[PDB]
Write a protein that binds this ligand. Structure first.
Ligand SMILES: Nc1ncnc2c1ncn2[C@@H]1O[C@H](COP(=O)(O)OP(=O)(O)OP(O)(O)=S)[C@@H](O)[C@H]1O
Ligand SMILES: Nc1ncnc2c1ncn2[C@@H]1O[C@H](COP(=O)(O)OP(=O)(O)OP(O)(O)=S)[C@@H](O)[C@H]1O
Ligand SMILES: Nc1ncnc2c1ncn2[C@@H]1O[C@H](COP(=O)(O)OP(=O)(O)OP(O)(O)=S)[C@@H](O)[C@H]1O
Ligand SMILES: Nc1ncnc2c1ncn2[C@@H]1O[C@H](COP(=O)(O)OP(=O)(O)O)[C@@H](O)[C@H]1O
Ligand SMILES: [Mg+2]
Ligand SMILES: [Mg+2]
Ligand SMILES: [Mg+2]
Lengths: 340, 254, 327, 319, 335, 258
């Protein structure tokens, strides 16, 4: 029963092993969980719309809230979870969602009311609402407007612009903030201590620095570093270099070579060095980000050069965000910034 | 609480067959003198109203009325387990989230039990029945079904006209026109085949054939059907039960 | 009980006297109903202006407490096709009421999602059955309605809620709830609403939940800004000043510390800087052209994701290069 | 309240072809046809609210007299008008025997003919061809291109045009005289300006203004009906300086509750139908508007996108 | 041949020793293993390394696999036919074998399938539509104790950020020319080839650009022309499409007109009709146009800018020739 | 060669009705002691296995086993000519490209003969039946069909739970939950209605309702159905024939496995 769950969690990757089960495990998204804890004692949970960067804990927060609300018994009877792996057209929204909303709430047991608040409403959550078409979204308007007495709607998305304006107005907007080093160092250190991850001083803070506001990627990188340090068995501590090696970060010397080729060099030398660099597998997004950090941070370039480098890096990132060829985009970016 | 045991699951199944298709949501209410149920279609032209007295049951206990709403389709989906001869017991607490249907065979053997999820419906039972109708008539329900099934093919509207000693059903559409004329008569060789008519005022009303077709289903509950018509209100088609009745109120056309 | 509904649903207007903001249309509709000549209505407006509440209170005032039976209310949640029209709407219009005597009301809420064939079939239902029933079409976009259907109804444009009416509703809510609100906090709340009562009610409930107290204290600007995650005008103007005057590295550091100290979003800062720079009396419109173009491009890129630092540097560089033409 | 009164569009709906203030040529044509008889198959096309359905109704009534009930078959878009209906009911009506005067014929009125399916329209050809001596067909549509060419080849084509200022003014003056309403010249001018050749919309706005304020004045008309939307959009696009267009977009459109989709779409229409500027600059402005339309459809619809669209249009106009 | 000499375990790998050690570290504890995404240049050997890692997570029976068929029904009666590579320890799906119906196959098959878990290898994850990736986003997290994904791709550019975060990222850098030469040496000593001078092998690497799959295939193709005896000046065997692209660039730099644009469109049509992707065509065309010594830096910069623009266009469009002809016309206008 | 004559074409038609729908390809093999046939569905959760002994036929001759595969749909298409009372003879040479079905009426009168094209299927008959199952039970097949038809409406999964003297079928889904509880009992008034149960170990398995629905078809071949369950293998539902049996082996759902 519970022991099987404990063992399955212990044999699970750290992303799912340390998933927040209660509203207190949320480390940084405090403004939303404060309201969620206050409404736990009341019974006026409004329709909610979670939006923010990926890996901020929206799904974990709503799961912990539904748990703390309904208990592990009513967790499976008063919840309608619809993900992006299911059909969510107009037909589905009109039939299934509306039939579940029109239905009455299931009767709680005697053990439920003694430990959990058991609100008189159920919860219908729609994860990854970006893939929902606007007509199927507008179909949900009156469905969530008239049956609010018996069901509550929780939308979850990454881009709040993909959801129509009426739905965004009907739901309370909860913006999840990026999890940088400051507001996630406590959670990362807790995960490291619970797994006996022996690292150096500036490793964890560096990991989140590579994560760029993503605790899931940081936990995955920490798990990979711990596995790589346990395989060696040397008993030493994990270093920031070993972490940034497996994180896809280009070494500093290779980036300085690119800066030298951009500063001094013609089209042919730059093209040859780019062709050689693309042989070693590096993500073009990470290279663009590192070049942006170096160029904007270095206090040795003119402001007129800085405006142009910022606009060129922005254009290159916008083009790379569409599935383009990394080699062509990187070569074009380096050539355009070399003419400056 | 709700505790109603039907001798034969078949009676309840035929009753629900009557609400079937023409309505989606039904609001039941059990009380000290029995069970009532009302359902109105989306366009609000048809009301299906049921009344089952305490005596229609093999066992009925009620110390506290309970009102419960449910999806008709869900109910019928479950209403084919009665074996017809099975015993059926409807059960619910005073503040239900579900309705329990319990089918059992005479012997302890097989027990099929269902727990149907309820819907919350604002309690608002209508009381649109009239004291007097312009005209009243009863005739075998199988005859009424045939009359409706005939005319239906010709039009989406079937007119019922009543004059002294004459009842006339008429349909007129694309392929042509049709009419069925019946006259009152007492058959002593068996009065369940007689056709009675009491006319206080001639009437002439038109109904949507699609609705009359829904209504004829009541034939399975009673040998005769009573039809009460008025120019002031919805028409009443009634199918009597032993201690009870199933009524269909249908609003005339314009 | 009504204490379980959210504040957006709990405070839904039930009478025409509780619908604030709309006065020219509310009085005209009241006169239409009192004098008897109620034509086919077309309530066009943005979300959260009070069109559905207005028509619901109107039907309540017309038919009484039995509104839910004498009115045919169809919306996008229900199947609205051409056959649905042909059967349901025509049978409702051609027949009469089963509860009383009087004209009927068909409320086609959110009718901007109806099919073109459905509107083509309904435009002759509205013109044929016009002595015993009426039609009310609610819309947010007037381009999804055919011109034939658009010409048969009297159009009423629901303007966004002004300051007076939204403050009146806020005062009503503060009377109904054991809650106090600061004047500057109220002004900041009105600023982040754009005439949307839903947002105001939602964030008011959320900041009441944020109070953490038995509500013996007040709600200040800090509570509102920390609960809605919206940037403050102080940090907004500080970032704008550091971008316009200070150095590139210093501007980058200022933007980073501002967006990381309160967890602010880059899109909110972009919109705030756009709103602030709209009052700037500037030179030759080339700077405004470049600024608007680059800011809209960066906003459209943010609407799809990417590197937040790269986009922030892009915003800084775009504003700087746009203002470099003003010299 | 217990009951309502009939609207002025339905109450004062013309019942005789002389009361129609539409296109004079086609009106006198139909009047002479009803006087002499031998009504041919016809297709009346035009824009909504100019007197197309009323015209054919008046023609059928005047041509059939008392036999209108049993000689006219009305089929609107609200009724099923598929292949099965054309096969059964229309053919049964055309084959129906009816004793009529030696100058009249049975009339089949088909409202909204542009919505009939291709199969029904194809089947109607021989249906109207084999019974063209005792049954006549009158179609009323808004787009004549939606009706197949074989059907148009067997009938006359009557294209109704917009109603000039004089005709709508005369009809409104007749209605005011028949209703004893207090009005003024500027109020009627504003009504006709907001009507845009739409007689039905004009009468509806007049009745609404009367029932809302009593006096038909330009102030009341403007406060109860906003100005023609396309005109403010045209004035915004035709602005010479960027700040003027921005202030217009902010105050007139954005501060009054007009959605961004309506603004951009109305914007596209204004441009497409523009004639002040050349073709190439119009195409470039349409390109910029359509790029903004793209951005807006993806959910990025804000004021900044419309401001950038206006800035790009001005940059294109900036030589 | 490429297939006759291929490593089957982690100890049989012969390049990227750090990557082999990282794979051994990741396979030391196989049950607490997150999802993996192998990214890098095409032809590096990531598909062999994933199977070698599976050979460490499970028994040697992972290579004994079978091909089955599964049918799917879309919203209409069009039947989607998809073949599946299955093994008693893992299964492989390639959603790049159909059109916009990747989401249906992904969701249904993965839900049906969902040591103790069964591995899933998604081949060519770049062809996965955004809707299919969104559908897989929650399937990756809901079933993490029964299904582990090993997605093989050549560039994480079209992969969405949620999927990137939901799995570990493993880069596979192309092997150095020296390692390629050492591998070709063992191959030619095992296949009994005659080399007059060893340096030719190096040149093969210099003609493959890190690609081992292309290197071995070209070595074997030129070994059949020299009759199993490679000389000091054996010609380099280039694919037909590369020669067509080179002739196209020669035509471009020689003549810049609409009459030549017509035959350029004809060549593009003939290339696209023979199962050649348009992105690779554009990449090779641009890279070989930059190699033209007749042009200057001003021409090459405009060429690379137009190629990036039209690559974005092609990634946002579906009619590939509509973008290829536009890029060719823009290059003609530039020169 | 294959030479098997059924007294009544009806028996063969009902047998094939059992493979019908749930499987596409069937592999038959006739031999000295009778005919066997096996068919596995695409997802491999259901195996349909038939055995007809020599005595079930009116005439059977086999001096050389023949294995033949065919499309089930093609076979049933042809399997409605038996008049039920017609005589049916299955015929095939030792290396067949077809299978001949010969229906004849008593008198020489009418002779319907078919020549069905065969499919080549790699011969690989499975032998997954267990020595002992955790629990064994038999009950009237019409009763089992009703039990399955009841619960099916509620869910895509029907759980079978066995404890001492108790058999319980359960379904739980969207509209609610249902259960059918039956108890062992010997009816002497006619033992074909009895419900037997031998439990060596309590069992609790879940099956996909769509599959149980395919299986209930066997009611038409036998009055009773035997159900054998184990936590170690596919469940066995068996319908006895006079000299033979039709068996359905169904893999329990793992959590999601039909
Ligand atoms: N605030 C947080 N506190 C603790 N752990 C967190 C937090 N946010 C994310 N995590 C970890 O990251 C895992 C993923 O959480 P999710 O809620 O799925 O992230 P996400 O916001 O849903 O990203 P998506 O699904 O791509 S939009 C959790 O199981 C935790 O292990
Ligand atoms: N004028 C108003 N006065 C008071 N409360 C209002 C007003 N407008 C909106 N509200 C509040 O906002 C809620 C939603 O109003 P609705 O009428 O549903 O919005 P809407 O105008 O119909 O826009 P939609 O539904 O998105 S198209 C109401 O229940 C009120 O609580
Ligand atoms: N020429 C006219 N003279 C007088 N009243 C007119 C005239 N044209 C339209 N009207 C008024 O407008 C009402 C509706 O006219 P219709 O003929 O139905 O409009 P329409 O030209 O057919 O365009 P549709 O029906 O939208 S395609 C009539 O009942 C009259 O009140
Ligand atoms: N460790 C290795 N040692 C030697 N040759 C290898 C090794 N791994 C892969 N190869 C070979 O190098 C080539 C790489 O191409 P390919 O296998 O298509 O790459 P991928 O595995 O990424 O699809 C093939 O010929 C492959 O067999
Ligand atoms: Mg999520
Ligand atoms: Mg609304
Ligand atoms: Mg008309």
């Amino acid at each position: 029963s519970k022991l099987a769950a404990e063992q399955s969690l212990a044999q699970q990757p750290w992303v799912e092993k340390y998933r927040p089960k209660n509203l207190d495990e949320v480390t940084a998204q405090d403004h939303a969980v404060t309201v969620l804890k206050k409404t736990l004692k009341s019974a006026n949970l409004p329709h909610m719309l979670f939006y923010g960067p990926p890996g901020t804990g929206k799904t974990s927060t709503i799961l912990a809230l539904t748990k703390e609300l309904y208990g592990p018994d009513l967790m499976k009877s008063r919840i309608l979870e619809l993900n992006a792996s299911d059909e969510r057209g107009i037909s589905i929204v009109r039939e299934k969602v509306k039939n579940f909303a029109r239905l009455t709430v299931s009767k709680p047991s005697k053990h439920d009311l003694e430990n959990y608040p058991c609100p008189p409403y159920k919860i219908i959550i729609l994860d990854e609402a970006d893939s929902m078409t606007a007509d199927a979204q507008s179909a949900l308007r009156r469905t969530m407007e008239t049956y609010s007495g018996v069901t509550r709607f929780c939308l979850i998305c990454n881009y709040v612009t993909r959801i129509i304006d009426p739905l965004a107005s009907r739901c309370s907007k909860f913006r999840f903030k990026a999890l940088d080093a400051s507001n996630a160092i406590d959670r990362l250190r807790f995960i490291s201590e619970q797994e006996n991850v022996k690292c150096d001083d500036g490793v964890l803070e560096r990991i989140l620095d590579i994560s760029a506001g993503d605790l899931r990627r940081g936990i995955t990188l920490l798990q990979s570093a711990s596995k790589g340090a346990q395989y060696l068995g040397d008993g030493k501590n994990i270093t920031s270099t070993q972490v940034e090696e497996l994180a896809g970060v280009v070494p500093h010397d290779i980036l300085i070579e690119i800066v030298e080729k951009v500063k001094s060099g013609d089209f042919d030398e730059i093209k040859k060095y780019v062709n050689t660099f693309m042989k070693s597998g590096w993500s073009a997004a990470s290279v663009v980000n590192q070049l942006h950090e170096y160029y904007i941070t270095n206090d040795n370039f003119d402001t007129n050069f800085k405006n142009q480098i910022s606009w060129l890096l922005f254009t290159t990132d916008s083009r790379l965000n569409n599935g383009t060829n990394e080699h062509i985009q990187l070569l074009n970016l380096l050539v355009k910034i070399s003419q400056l | 609480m709700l505790e109603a045991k039907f001798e034969e699951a078949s009676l309840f199944k035929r009753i629900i067959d009557g609400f079937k298709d023409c309505v989606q949501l039904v609001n039941f209410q059990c009380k000290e003198d029995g069970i009532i149920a009302q359902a109105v279609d989306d366009s609000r032209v048809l009301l299906v109203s049921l009344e089952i007295g305490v005596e229609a049951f093999q066992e009925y206990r009620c110390d506290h009325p309970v009102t419960l709403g449910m999806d008709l389709t869900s109910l019928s989906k479950i209403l084919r387990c009665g074996n017809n001869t099975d015993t059926l017991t409807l059960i619910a607490d005073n503040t239900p989230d579900s309705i329990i249907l319990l089918f059992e065979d005479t012997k302890k053997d097989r027990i099929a039990e269902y727990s149907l999820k309820l819907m919350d419906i604002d309690a608002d039972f209508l009381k649109i029945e009239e004291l007097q109708y312009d005209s009243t008539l009863s005739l075998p329900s199988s005859e009424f079904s045939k009359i409706v099934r005939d005319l239906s093919q010709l039009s989406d509207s079937i007119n019922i006209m009543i004059t002294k000693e004459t009842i006339k059903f008429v349909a007129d559409g694309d392929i042509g026109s049709g009419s069925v004329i019946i006259k009152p008569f007492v058959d002593m060789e068996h009065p369940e085949t007689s056709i009675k008519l009491e006319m206080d005022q001639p009437v002439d009303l038109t109904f949507g054939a699609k609705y009359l077709l829904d209504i004829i289903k009541g034939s399975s509950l009673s040998d005769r059907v009573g039809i009460r018509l008025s120019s002031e209100a919805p028409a009443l088609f009634q199918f009597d039960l032993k201690s009870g009745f199933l009524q269909f109120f249908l609003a005339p056309k314009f | 009980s009504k204490e379980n509904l959210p504040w957006v649903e709990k405070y839904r207007p039930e009478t025409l006297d509780e619908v604030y903001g709309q006065n020219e249309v509310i009085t005209t509709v009241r006169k239409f109903v009192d004098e008897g000549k109620l034509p086919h209505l077309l309530f066009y407006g943005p979300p959260g202006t009070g069109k559905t509440s207005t028509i619901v209170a109107l039907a309540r005032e017309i038919y009484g407490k039995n509104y839910s039976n004498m009115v045919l209310e169809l919306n996008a949640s229900d199947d609205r096709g051409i056959d649905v029209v042909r059967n349901q709407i025509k049978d409702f219009a051609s027949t009469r009421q089963i509860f009383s005597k009087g004209f009927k009301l068909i409320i086609l809420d959110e009718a901007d999602a109806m099919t073109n064939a459905a509107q083509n079939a309904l435009r002759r239902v509205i013109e044929r059955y016009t002595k015993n029933t009426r039609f009310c079409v609610l819309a947010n976009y007037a381009h999804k309605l055919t011109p034939a259907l658009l010409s048969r109804c009297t159009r009423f444009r629901f303007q966004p809620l002004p300051q007076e009416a939204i403050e009146r509703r806020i005062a009503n809510v503060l009377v109904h709830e054991k809650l106090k609100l600061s004047p500057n906090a109220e002004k900041a709340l009105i600023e982040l609403s754009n005439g949307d009562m839903r947002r105001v009610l939602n964030v008011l409930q959320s900041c009441k939940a944020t109070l953490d107290n038995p509500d013996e204290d007040e709600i200040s600007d800090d509570v509102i800004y920390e609960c809605c995650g919206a940037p403050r005008p102080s940090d907004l103007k500080a970032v704008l000043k550091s971008i316009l005057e200070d150095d590139w590295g210093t501007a980058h550091y200022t933007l980073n510390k501002v967006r990381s100290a309160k967890g602010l979003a880059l899109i909110d800062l972009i919109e705030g800087i756009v709103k602030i720079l709209e009052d700037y009396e500037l030179q030759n419109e080339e700077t405004r052209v470049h600024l608007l173009t680059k800011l809209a491009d960066i906003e459209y890129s943010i609407s799809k994701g990417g590197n937040d630092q790269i986009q922030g540097s892009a915003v800084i560089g775009a504003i700087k290069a746009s203002f470099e033409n003003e010299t | 309240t217990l009951s309502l009164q009939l609207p002025w569009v339905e109450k004062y709906r013309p019942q005789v072809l002389s009361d129609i203030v539409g296109n004079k040529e086609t009106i006198d044509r139909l009047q002479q046809i009803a006087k002499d008889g031998n009504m041919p198959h016809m297709i009346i096309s035009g824009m909504p609210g100019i007197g197309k359905t009323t015209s054919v109704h008046c023609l059928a009534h005047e041509l059939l007299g008392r036999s209108y009930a049993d000689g006219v078959l009305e089929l609107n878009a609200s009724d099923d008008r598929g292949i099965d209906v054309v096969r059964n009911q229309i053919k049964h009506f055309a084959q129906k025997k009816l004793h009529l005067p030696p100058g009249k014929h049975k009339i089949v009125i088909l409202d909204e003919a542009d919505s009939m399916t291709a199969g029904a329209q194809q089947a109607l050809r021989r249906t109207m061809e084999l019974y063209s001596n005792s049954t006549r067909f009158a179609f009323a549509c808004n787009q004549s291109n939606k009706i197949i060419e074989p059907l148009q080849s067997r009938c006359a084509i009557l294209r109704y045009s917009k109603l000039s200022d004089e005709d709508v003014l005369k009809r409104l003056l007749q209605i005011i005289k028949l209703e004893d309403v207090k009005y003024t010249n500027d109020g009627l001018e504003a009504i006709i300006f907001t009507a845009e050749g739409d007689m039905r919309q004009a009468i509806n706005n007049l009745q609404s203004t009367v029932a809302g304020h009593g006096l038909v004045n330009a102030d009341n008309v403007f406060k109860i009906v906003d100005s023609p939307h396309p005109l403010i959009v045209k004035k915004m696009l035709l602005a010479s300086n960027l700040e003027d267009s921005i202030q217009i977009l902010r105050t007139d459109l954005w501060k009054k509750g007009y959605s961004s989709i309506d603004i951009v779409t109305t914007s596209f229409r204004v441009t497409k139908n523009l004639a002040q500027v050349k073709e190439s600059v119009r195409l470039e402005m349409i390109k910029e508007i359509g790029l903004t339309h793209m951005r807006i459809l993806e959910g990025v619809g804000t004021y900044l996108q419309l401001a950038s669209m206006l800035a790009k249009i001005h940059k294109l106009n900036n030589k | 041949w490429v297939d006759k000499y291929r490593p089957k375990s982690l100890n049989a790998l012969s390049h990227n020793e750090e990557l082999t050690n990282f794979l051994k570290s990741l396979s030391d504890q196989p049950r607490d293993l997150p999802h993996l995404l192998l990214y890098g240049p095409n032809g590096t050997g990531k598909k062999t390394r994933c199977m070698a890692l599976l050979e460490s997570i499970f028994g040697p029976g992972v290579y004994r696999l079978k091909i089955d068929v599964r049918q799917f029904v879309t919203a209409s009666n069009r039947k989607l036919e998809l073949n599946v590579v299955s093994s008693p320890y893992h299964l492989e799906i390639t959603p790049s074998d159909m059109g916009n119906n990747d989401r249906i196959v992904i969701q249904e098959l993965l839900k049906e399938v969902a040591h103790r878990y069964k591995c899933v290898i998604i081949n060519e994850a770049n062809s996965l539509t955004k809707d299919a990736q969104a559908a897989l986003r929650r399937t990756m997290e809901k079933y993490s104790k029964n299904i582990r994904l090993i997605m093989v791709c050549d560039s994480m550019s079209p992969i969405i950020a949620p999927i990137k975060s939901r799995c570990l990222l493993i880069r596979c850098p192309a092997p150095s020319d020296s390692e390629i030469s050492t591998i070709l040496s063992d191959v030619v000593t095992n296949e009994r080839i005659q080399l007059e001078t060893k340096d030719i092998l190096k040149r093969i690497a210099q003609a493959s650009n890190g690609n081992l799959r292309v290197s071995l295939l070209m070595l074997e193709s030129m070994a059949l022309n020299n009759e199993l005896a490679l000389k000091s000046s054996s010609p380099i065997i280039k694919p037909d499409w590369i020669i067509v692209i080179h002739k196209l660039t020669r035509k471009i730099v020689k003549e810049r007109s609409v009459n030549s644009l017509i035959e350029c469109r004809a060549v593009l049509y003939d290339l696209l009709a023979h199962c050649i992707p348009a992105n690779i065509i554009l990449k090779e065309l641009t890279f070989s146009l930059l190699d033209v010594e007749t042009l200057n830096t001003t021409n090459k910069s405009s060429i690379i800018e137009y190629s990036s623009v039209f690559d974005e266009r092609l990634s946002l469009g579906n009619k590939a020739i509509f973008h290829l002809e536009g890029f060719i016309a823009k290059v003609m206008c530039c020169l």
